[PDB]
Amino acid sequence: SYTNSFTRGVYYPDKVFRSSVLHSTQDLFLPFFSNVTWFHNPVLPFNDGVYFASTEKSNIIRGWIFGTTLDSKTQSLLIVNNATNVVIKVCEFQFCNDPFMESEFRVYSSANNCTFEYVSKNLREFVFKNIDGYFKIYSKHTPIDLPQGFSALEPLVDLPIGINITRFQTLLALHRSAYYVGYLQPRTFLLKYNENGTITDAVDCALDPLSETKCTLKSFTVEKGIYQTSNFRVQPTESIVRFPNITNLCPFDEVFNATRFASVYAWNRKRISNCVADYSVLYNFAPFFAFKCYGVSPTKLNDLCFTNVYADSFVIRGNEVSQIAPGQTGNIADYNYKLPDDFTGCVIAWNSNKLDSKVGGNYNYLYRLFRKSNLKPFERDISTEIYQAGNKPCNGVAGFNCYFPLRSYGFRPTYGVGHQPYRVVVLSFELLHAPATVCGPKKSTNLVKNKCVNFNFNGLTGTGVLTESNKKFLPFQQFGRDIADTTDAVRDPQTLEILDITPCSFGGVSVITPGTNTSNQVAVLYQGVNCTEVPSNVFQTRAGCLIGAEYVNNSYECDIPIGAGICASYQTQSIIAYTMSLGAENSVAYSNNSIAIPTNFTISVTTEILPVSMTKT
Amino acid sequence: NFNFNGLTGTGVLTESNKKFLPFQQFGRDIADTTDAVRDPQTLEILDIT
Amino acid sequence: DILSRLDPPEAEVQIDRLITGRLQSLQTYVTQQLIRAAEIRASANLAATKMSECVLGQSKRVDFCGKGYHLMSFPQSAPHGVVFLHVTYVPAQEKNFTTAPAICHDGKAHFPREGVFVSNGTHWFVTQRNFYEPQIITTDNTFVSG
Amino acid sequence: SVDCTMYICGDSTECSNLLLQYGSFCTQLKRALTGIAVEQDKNTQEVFAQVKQIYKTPPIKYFGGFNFSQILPDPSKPSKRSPIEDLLFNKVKFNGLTVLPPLLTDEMIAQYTSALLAGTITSGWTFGAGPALQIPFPMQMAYRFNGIGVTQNVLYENQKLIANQFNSAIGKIQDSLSALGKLQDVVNHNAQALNTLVKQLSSKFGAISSVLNDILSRLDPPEAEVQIDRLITGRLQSLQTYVTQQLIRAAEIRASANLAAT
Amino acid sequence: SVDCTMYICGDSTECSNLLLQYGSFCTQLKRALTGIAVEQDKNTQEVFA
Ligand SMILES: *[C@@H]1O[C@H](CO)[C@@H](O[C@@H]2O[C@H](CO)[C@@H](O)[C@H](O)[C@H]2NC(C)=O)[C@H](O)[C@H]1NC(C)=O
Ligand SMILES: *[C@@H]1O[C@H](CO)[C@@H](O[C@@H]2O[C@H](CO)[C@@H](O)[C@H](O)[C@H]2NC(C)=O)[C@H](O)[C@H]1NC(C)=O
Ligand SMILES: *[C@@H]1O[C@H](CO)[C@@H](O[C@@H]2O[C@H](CO)[C@@H](O)[C@H](O)[C@H]2NC(C)=O)[C@H](O)[C@H]1NC(C)=O
Ligand SMILES: *[C@@H]1O[C@H](CO)[C@@H](O[C@@H]2O[C@H](CO)[C@@H](O)[C@H](O)[C@H]2NC(C)=O)[C@H](O)[C@H]1NC(C)=O
Ligand SMILES: *[C@@H]1O[C@H](CO)[C@@H](O[C@@H]2O[C@H](CO)[C@@H](O)[C@H](O)[C@H]2NC(C)=O)[C@H](O)[C@H]1NC(C)=O
Ligand SMILES: *[C@@H]1O[C@H](CO)[C@@H](O[C@@H]2O[C@H](CO)[C@@H](O)[C@H](O)[C@H]2NC(C)=O)[C@H](O)[C@H]1NC(C)=O
Ligand SMILES: *[C@@H]1O[C@H](CO)[C@@H](O[C@@H]2O[C@H](CO)[C@@H](O)[C@H](O)[C@H]2NC(C)=O)[C@H](O)[C@H]1NC(C)=O
Ligand SMILES: *[C@@H]1O[C@H](CO)[C@@H](O)[C@H](O)[C@H]1NC(C)=O
Ligand SMILES: *[C@@H]1O[C@H](CO)[C@@H](O)[C@H](O)[C@H]1NC(C)=O
Ligand SMILES: *[C@@H]1O[C@H](CO)[C@@H](O)[C@H](O)[C@H]1NC(C)=O
Ligand SMILES: *[C@@H]1O[C@H](CO)[C@@H](O)[C@H](O)[C@H]1NC(C)=O
Ligand SMILES: *[C@@H]1O[C@H](CO)[C@@H](O)[C@H](O)[C@H]1NC(C)=O
Ligand SMILES: *[C@@H]1O[C@H](CO)[C@@H](O)[C@H](O)[C@H]1NC(C)=O
Ligand SMILES: *[C@@H]1O[C@H](CO)[C@@H](O)[C@H](O)[C@H]1NC(C)=O
Ligand SMILES: *[C@@H]1O[C@H](CO)[C@@H](O)[C@H](O)[C@H]1NC(C)=O
Ligand SMILES: *[C@@H]1O[C@H](CO)[C@@H](O)[C@H](O)[C@H]1NC(C)=O
């Protein structure tokens, strides 16, 4: 259900005293004229405070339960009140799922680790809130569906508990031999204090189109006139990020498909240039066996930008792929190909048995296994000088202590894993000094028009409505600016069309009132807002859109001036708009031989008031 | 030079004729400046010229 | 709070922020009073001018000492200013008559010395311009030229 | 009218909580500018709205010779301006800034002027003190010469000469027009203050940048609060300069409107 | 009249370049003082001439 509150759930925001002072406060209240659920039970949410009213001469409500889990294994709050007085308590409980001679208290069956103790028709109101670990309760008991009136609630307790609350329940006294639940929202009120210091009236701000006013003037009585209270601001929808196309993919398609790879000792080296790089070819390309990326993650390859993308490729034995990695050793990684210790590239490696595995031995791929000292990172050595291990110089003849430095793999299809030829490719980035280079690919986003949108046109970030233009750029210019140097037109990278940009459509909001001593009807003017972009009586004026007043064809004396010849009055009641009357119409009976002469006169008396001084401060 | 449980100020303390609500410690004139306090021990309202 | 949770080299920075803010606000306050002070002074100069010209004399200036023809004014004091009570002459109850710029008699042109020639339908008289009071057309209230 | 929050911060919402920490400076700007806005419509009413009824001239429009067609409205126009008024009007949105329309349209002002012209040509000065009293215009001119110490026969015997000489003398006024620099200066002074107010947003005031979003994009909050606070102070000073000058300049146009009403 | 650069910096190149980060404040200062200096000669022509 949902009952309609009137002006309920207003409590003293704090200590402090205060006499006749229309004080403005911001805090957690129950909004005026709110939708409050009705119960005659289940676990209810908390979310931010609770309003709790009830009606009944007897006492049916027998405490509350609060907390996060409403169960054991964690501490919770329990508030009961027998015929003695209120008992606050905070322990770890075990609550009956249905809690309720003249014997009672079958609510819980455990009270461990108690951290707080305390002992000591009709409308009984409560306000519950929980801020910075403090659980506040306001209450008042006033004797008489709820009625209609105002009554401020005073603090009851101050409880330094620390407890978190997200849900709560209620407790009722059964028969063996009606309550409300609201919630609080951050609102602003204008509170009227009497000379005794109590709150006698209030105004809900951010509510009616009117009250939106009582808050601006800091009063509960508004005099007739027109008041500027707020503003209208159209909001943008959707976020469209436009960009160019591609131009060039920068063909990985060869380096990863070269029919004749290179032996490891003389490994090929292809350097990417300024291009478009789409690694979505890879991560979702072949089946692969090894793909490890050291500098950057495998998914963020399409949102960074690097200068030089080096690509190495070769073939090696199976169980040696564990050596293409920063800081390793072995006959292959020692001196055939050495990756540094601060690598930033990305290693890919897969099996290519069926493509580079011929029967009878395929002796093309060599791999050096003799050298003076280990290699340098990214260095290359292709010599064929005969090794020398002994002490007698070789003079370039194989034999004793003079070994050829190059051997060849084999690769017959009938090998086990770890000896079949694997193909390895490695990527390596480096950003020397370039201002910008090959980056990831750009995700477009279409392009809608005639809508306030959040746009980005390849770096140009802004907000506004996009419309077809009539400007003509030069055939090298992307966007235009107006006088005072603000962007007002762009060119779409893809379609090459010029589009104008215009902010949303804000403006002031004014409230037209006949005076609270006449009526509570009101009309609202949205200043220079078109009547199609505002979200009966809608009237368009050169000053904006007037809503809530009827426009008539008569002409009266101006009462409340709107602007551009339009005034408003409270006559015909209701609220209307119209065009002012300057005055009557007199037609003098002029002729070339007629005169008018007075035969009587009156003595008239008028006053004029003039300020002469001010206060000396 | 006075301090009433946190309220720091300067001025002359005199017997008042205001009546606070039975939960209020002090108050603030129009323009929100403290002009009266309650003594925590004796529970009497004093003006602070 | 600034001199209790900061060392001297750290509290100076926070005090300068308060001085700058409060000084800016106080300097704005005094500038706005100079701007308003010129306006009250200009109003007082107008009140002093009307005191001489409306109370100590009879003015012919149009709409300066009330609405109508100025007869007299009386001052009254007010808390921060002055109130003038303006007494004016206002004509009422006009009738139409017929006029002529001059009268021909003996071949000569006669003009009024201080009035206007009017006709009630059958006879011609001279009136004063602000109050209807006919007189007989004579050689005592007219002059001849041409 | 300037939107204080949109001028200083500009769209950003992290800024709004910081701007609230400077107190009521934005309230002062709105109150000060509203005072100007209300007075500018009152200035116009006091100069022109000095007539109760809207007077009209008779159809014939022939006042003993004198020819006033250059100052009376032209019935063959949508605007109903006079020939001379047509010459007079032929010679003279941003980041939170807006221009409000006047309360009185220029058609309504033209109606006040035609009422003053029709009252004067038919009843002289009598309608400003009471009821309008008709008198022939030739006789009105003769009283006016009497007021300056000239005997009234000088007009009555020379009526044609004075009317013909007047008609040429007024006719020369258009030649001197086809001057209004005092009216263009008012337009220029406000246009210059609005062009300067907007340009002052592209200033760093000694901060790392001049854009409150870019600061965050390349800096942590602890240091971004300081950089944004510097820009806020600078642009808040811009608004104080702007509003102070509008008040000083509005007093000058008010003194001019008082002279024109007098 | 006041030269803004001589007042603020006073023959200092480090300061003079820093003035470029404040925009057109000197433009406003020169026009404000010049606009009221021209009126001072007009004031004397209207009284005596
Ligand atoms: C790498 O090369 C192979 C073969 O050279 C390409 O595979 C072709 O696959 C498509 C899709 O099934 C077929 O339509 C073609 O006929 C195949 N080529 C041949 C010669 O038959 C493969 O597309 C290449 N890689 C990329 C990324 O394009
Ligand atoms: C960017 O790519 C799009 C396609 O994705 C191009 O769109 C073509 O535009 C021409 C006219 O210029 C049309 O005739 C084609 O039919 C369009 N193609 C498609 C698929 O719609 C666009 O021209 C490209 N932009 C540039 C600058 O080259
Ligand atoms: C002066 O006489 C004229 C007529 O010559 C009066 O004007 C007319 O008044 C009647 C109403 O009584 C109107 O219906 C006519 O339209 C008027 N005529 C014109 C041309 O306007 C006028 O009332 C008389 N004035 C006085 C003060 O009695
Ligand atoms: C001039 O007008 C006044 C009214 O303004 C006339 O005086 C009134 O006369 C009537 C009729 O005798 C009385 O009932 C009123 O009491 C008088 N008013 C006042 C204020 O005394 C006066 O008679 C008119 N004069 C002429 C010559 O007609
Ligand atoms: C704080 O303690 C003092 C005593 O130190 C209390 O003073 C008593 O006040 C009552 C009246 O309220 C007197 O009848 C007693 O005689 C006082 N006692 C003494 C020793 O003077 C004071 O009431 C206490 N305050 C509170 C709020 O309980
Ligand atoms: C114009 O005024 C004159 C003077 O009042 C009027 O003439 C007199 O009228 C009275 C009666 O009202 C007679 O007793 C006199 O004998 C008249 N005098 C003369 C010299 O004849 C005259 O009637 C008025 N005209 C109109 C049209 O009212
Ligand atoms: C009032 O003056 C205007 C000129 O300012 C007269 O209108 C012009 O009259 C001449 C002939 O004398 C024509 O050639 C022009 O074409 C007329 N101008 C227009 C705009 O029509 C007007 O006739 C004068 N009125 C009187 C009653 O003499
Ligand atoms: C409560 O508010 C809802 C809208 O939120 C409305 O539909 C409903 O009718 C209201 N209930 C009552 C009892 O007014
Ligand atoms: C009232 O309830 C509290 C909490 O259960 C208990 O401690 C107290 O003894 C009760 N009083 C009586 C009279 O039963
Ligand atoms: C309460 O019990 C919990 C375990 O359920 C324990 O972690 C906590 O220390 C206990 N509190 C006290 C005060 O003993
Ligand atoms: C309450 O829950 C929040 C998470 O929702 C947690 O961060 C916070 O520490 C809790 N408060 C207490 C007092 O345990
Ligand atoms: C409370 O206020 C009423 C007026 O509403 C006044 O008559 C009464 O004296 C006040 N009570 C006290 C204790 O001041
Ligand atoms: C204002 O209210 C009072 C009663 O409080 C009433 O006498 C008066 O007529 C009202 N004024 C208007 C303009 O309605
Ligand atoms: C509002 O927009 C519509 C088009 O959507 C246009 O026809 C209308 O003239 C606009 N109103 C104003 C006041 O500009
Ligand atoms: C006002 O009159 C116009 C014709 O001049 C007519 O079209 C329009 O409907 C009228 N307005 C009302 C509200 O009757
Ligand atoms: C008097 O006015 C009429 C028009 O009403 C005009 O025809 C006539 O010429 C005028 N008489 C004189 C003498 O100007």
Burial class from Cβ neighbours inside 10 Å (0-12, 13-18, 19+) for residue A506 reads buried
Burial class from Cβ neighbours inside 10 Å (0-12, 13-18, 19+) for residue A321 reads buried
Considering only CB atoms, D195 lies closest to which of A484, A528, A592, namely A484
A463 in contact with chain D, both atoms CB, cutoff 8 A: yes
Structure tokens at A552: 């008539």
Structure tokens at A120: 């000591």
With beta carbons under 8 A apart, name residues in chain D contacting A600: none
How close is the Cα of A95 to the center of ligand 9, in Å?
18
Distance, in Å, from the CA atom of A104 to the CA atom of A101, rounded to the nearest integer, reads: 9
CA distance A512 to chain D (A): 16
Considering only CB atoms, A600 lies closest to which of C86, C92, C98, namely C92
Are the Cβ atoms of A597 and C94 closer than 8 angstroms?
Answer: yes
Of C104, C121, A590, C96, residue with least CA distance to D136: A590
CA distance D138 to chain C (A): 9
Are the Cβ atoms of E22 and D196 closer than 8 angstroms?
Answer: no
If you ran DSSP here, which 8-state letter would residue A281 be given? G
Cα angle at A556 between A551 and A561, to 5 degrees? 75
**Does residue A591's CB lie within 6 angstroms of at least one atom of ligand 3?**
no
How close is the Cα of A173 to the center of ligand 10, in Å?
32
Do residues A501 and A466 make contact, with C-beta atoms less than 8 angstroms apart? yes
Q: Which residues pair with A28 in a beta bridge?
A: A186
Structure tokens at D77: 């126009």
CA distance C79 to chain D (A): 24
User: In sequence order, what are the residues at sequence separation of 6 or more whose Cβ sits closer than 8 angstroms to the Cβ of residue A349?
Assistant: A288, A289, A290, A291, A321, A324, A422, A423, A424, A425
Do residues C62 and D116 make contact, with C-beta atoms less than 8 angstroms apart? no
> According to the 3-state scheme, what is the secondary structure of chain D?
CECHHHHHCCCCCHHHHHHHHHCCHHHHHHHHHHHHHHHHHHHHHHHHCCCCCEECCCCCCCECCECCCCCCCCCCCCCCCCHHHHHHCCCCCCCCECCCCCCCCHHHHHHHHHHHHHHHHHHCCHHHCCCCCCCCHHHHHHHHHHHCCCCCHHHHCCHHHHHHHHHHHHHHHHHHHCCCHHHHHHHHHHHHHHHHHHHCCCCCCCCCCCCCCHHHHCCCHHHHHHHHHHHHHHHHHHHHHHHHHHHHHHHHHHHHHHHHHC
User: In sequence order, what are the residues at sequence separation of 6 or more whose Cβ sits closer than 8 angstroms to the Cβ of residue A249?
Assistant: A275, A276, A278
C-alpha distances out from residue A288 to A346, A352, A428, Å: 14, 10, 19
**Other Cβ atoms closer than 10 A to D244:** 15
Longest dimension (CA), chain E: 50
Distance, in Å, from the CA atom of A314 to the CA atom of A258, rounded to the nearest integer, reads: 10
C-alpha distances out from residue C2 to B6, B9, C10, D222, D233, Å: 16, 16, 9, 19, 22
C-alpha distances out from residue A192 to A40, A198, A215, A524, B21, Å: 35, 8, 12, 26, 15
Distance, in Å, from the CA atom of A537 to the CA atom of A550, rounded to the nearest integer, reads: 6
Question: Do chain D and chain B touch with ≥3 beta carbon pairs under 8 Å?
Answer: no
Do residues C74 and A572 make contact, with C-beta atoms less than 8 angstroms apart? no
Distance, in Å, from the CA atom of A228 to the CA atom of A220, rounded to the nearest integer, reads: 16
With beta carbons under 8 A apart, name residues in chain A contacting B40: none
Q: How many residues does chain B have?
A: 49
Dihedral over Cα of A214, A218, A221, A224: its sign: negative
Structure tokens at A427: 């990527």
CA distance B23 to chain A (A): 7
For C59, the 3-state DSSP assignment is coil
Tell me the DSSP string of A207-254.
Answer: SSTTTTTHHHHT-S---SEEEEEEEE------EEEE----S----HHH
Distance, in Å, from the CA atom of A80 to the CA atom of A169, rounded to the nearest integer, reads: 13
Are the Cβ atoms of D205 and E22 closer than 8 angstroms?
Answer: yes
How close is the Cα of A133 to the center of ligand 11, in Å?
9
Q: Of the bound ligands, which one is closest to the alpha carbon of residue A35?
A: 8
Distance, in Å, from the CA atom of D233 to the CA atom of D227, rounded to the nearest integer, reads: 10
For A382, the 3-state DSSP assignment is coil
Interface of A with C in 361-420 (CB under 8 A): none
How close is the Cα of B42 to the center of ligand 5, in Å?
7
Q: Which residues pair with A508 in a beta bridge?
A: A231
> According to the 3-state scheme, what is the secondary structure of A453-468?
EEEEECCEEEEEEEEE
Structure tokens at C125: 């008289």
D255 in contact with chain A, both atoms CB, cutoff 8 A: no
Mutation site, A592, A593, A606, A617, interface C, largest C CB count within 10 A: A606
How close is the Cα of A383 to the center of ligand 7, in Å?
111
Amino acid at A137: I
Distance, in Å, from the CA atom of C47 to the CA atom of C76, rounded to the nearest integer, reads: 12
Distance, in Å, from the CA atom of C71 to the CA atom of C93, rounded to the nearest integer, reads: 20
Question: Do chain B and chain E touch with ≥3 beta carbon pairs under 8 Å?
Answer: no
Amino acid at A451: K
Are the Cβ atoms of A595 and C99 closer than 8 angstroms?
Answer: yes
A587 in contact with chain C, both atoms CB, cutoff 8 A: no
C-alpha distances out from residue D150 to A275, C111, D120, D143, D147, Å: 98, 14, 21, 9, 7
User: In sequence order, what are the residues at sequence separation of 6 or more whose Cβ sits closer than 8 angstroms to the Cβ of residue A140?
Assistant: A124, A125, A151, A152, A153, A154
If you ran DSSP here, which 8-state letter would residue E24 be given? S
Ligand 13 atom 9, closest CA: A517
Considering only CB atoms, A603 lies closest to which of C47, C89, C99, namely C89
Distance, in Å, from the CA atom of D211 to the CA atom of A577, rounded to the nearest integer, reads: 44
Do residues A236 and A504 make contact, with C-beta atoms less than 8 angstroms apart? yes
Ligand 2 atom 11, closest CA: A495
Do residues A146 and A123 make contact, with C-beta atoms less than 8 angstroms apart? yes
For A589, the 3-state DSSP assignment is coil
Of A352, A353, A331, A329, residue with least CA distance to A339: A329
Burial class from Cβ neighbours inside 10 Å (0-12, 13-18, 19+) for residue A420 reads buried
Structure tokens at D151: 């005997």
Burial class from Cβ neighbours inside 10 Å (0-12, 13-18, 19+) for residue E39 reads exposed
Structure tokens at A530: 């078109």
**Does residue A594's CB lie within 6 angstroms of at least one atom of ligand 16?**
no
Are the Cβ atoms of C82 and A610 closer than 8 angstroms?
Answer: yes
**Does residue A47's CB lie within 6 angstroms of at least one atom of ligand 14?**
no
Most ligand 5 atoms within 8 A of CB, residue of B39, B42, B44 to mutate: B42
Give the chain C residue nearest A602 (alpha carbons).
C90
Are the Cβ atoms of D134 and C21 closer than 8 angstroms?
Answer: no
Which residue bears the tokens 């200009």? C42
Do residues A78 and A99 make contact, with C-beta atoms less than 8 angstroms apart? no
**Does residue B19's CB lie within 6 angstroms of at least one atom of ligand 12?**
yes
Do residues A521 and A515 make contact, with C-beta atoms less than 8 angstroms apart? no
**Other Cβ atoms closer than 10 A to D203:** 19
Structure tokens at A69: 């889990």
Structure tokens at E29: 């200062």
Amino acid at D219: L
Distance, in Å, from the CA atom of A537 to the CA atom of A447, rounded to the nearest integer, reads: 36
| Burial state string for A441-475 with b = 16 or more CB within 10 A and e = fewer than 16 | bbeeeebeeeebbebebeeeebebbbeebeeeeee
If you ran DSSP here, which 8-state letter would residue A470 be given? -
With beta carbons under 8 A apart, name residues in chain D contacting A584: 52-54
CA distance A596 to chain C (A): 4
**Does residue C94's CB lie within 6 angstroms of at least one atom of ligand 3?**
yes
Of A526, A515, A504, residue with least CA distance to A230: A526
**Does residue A592's CB lie within 6 angstroms of at least one atom of ligand 16?**
yes
User: In sequence order, what are the residues at sequence separation of 6 or more whose Cβ sits closer than 8 angstroms to the Cβ of residue A184?
Assistant: A9, A28, A29, A30, A48, A49, A50, A51, A127, A129
Considering only CB atoms, A583 lies closest to which of D11, D54, D136, namely D54
Interface of A with C in 243-272 (CB under 8 A): none
Distance, in Å, from the CA atom of A543 to the CA atom of A399, rounded to the nearest integer, reads: 105
Distance, in Å, from the CA atom of D189 to the CA atom of B16, rounded to the nearest integer, reads: 58
How close is the Cα of A530 to the center of ligand 14, in Å?
6
How close is the Cα of A267 to the center of ligand 1, in Å?
25
Structure tokens at D40: 């500018």
Amino acid at A346: C
Do residues A563 and D102 make contact, with C-beta atoms less than 8 angstroms apart? yes
With beta carbons under 8 A apart, name residues in chain C contacting A603: 71, 87-90
Distance, in Å, from the CA atom of A277 to the CA atom of C2, rounded to the nearest integer, reads: 56
Distance, in Å, from the CA atom of A252 to the CA atom of A169, rounded to the nearest integer, reads: 65
Distance, in Å, from the CA atom of D121 to the CA atom of D135, rounded to the nearest integer, reads: 9
Distance, in Å, from the CA atom of C54 to the CA atom of C59, rounded to the nearest integer, reads: 6
CA distance D132 to chain E (A): 38
C-alpha distances out from residue A162 to A116, D133, D166, Å: 11, 89, 96
Which residue bears the tokens 């011929």? A358
Which residue bears the tokens 């079949």? A420
Do residues A513 and A213 make contact, with C-beta atoms less than 8 angstroms apart? yes
Cα angle at A241 between A238 and A245, to 5 degrees? 145
Q: Which atom of ligand 5 is nearest to the CA of B40?
A: 27
User: In sequence order, what are the residues at sequence separation of 6 or more whose Cβ sits closer than 8 angstroms to the Cβ of residue A598?
Assistant: C91, C92, C93, C94, C130, C131, C132, D130, D131, D133
C-alpha distances out from residue A104 to A62, A85, D183, Å: 11, 16, 90
If you ran DSSP here, which 8-state letter would residue B14 be given? E
C-alpha distances out from residue A617 to A453, A610, B30, Å: 53, 21, 19
Structure tokens at A150: 């105002």
Strand bridging mode A422-430 / A86-95: unpaired
Are the Cβ atoms of D134 and A594 closer than 8 angstroms?
Answer: yes
Distance, in Å, from the CA atom of A201 to the CA atom of A451, rounded to the nearest integer, reads: 44
Distance, in Å, from the CA atom of A232 to the CA atom of A146, rounded to the nearest integer, reads: 37
Distance, in Å, from the CA atom of E1 to the CA atom of E24, rounded to the nearest integer, reads: 17
Distance, in Å, from the CA atom of D197 to the CA atom of D3, rounded to the nearest integer, reads: 12
Considering only CB atoms, D244 lies closest to which of C25, C31, C109, namely C31
Chains that touch E (3 or more CB pairs under 8 A): D
E strand or H helix that includes residue A127: strand A122-131
Structure tokens at D220: 């942590």
CA distance A590 to chain C (A): 11
How close is the Cα of D70 to the center of ligand 7, in Å?
10
Tell me the DSSP string of A34-62.
Answer: -EEEEE----EE-SS-EEE-BB-SS--EE
E strand or H helix that includes residue A290: strand A290-293
Distance, in Å, from the CA atom of A203 to the CA atom of A208, rounded to the nearest integer, reads: 10
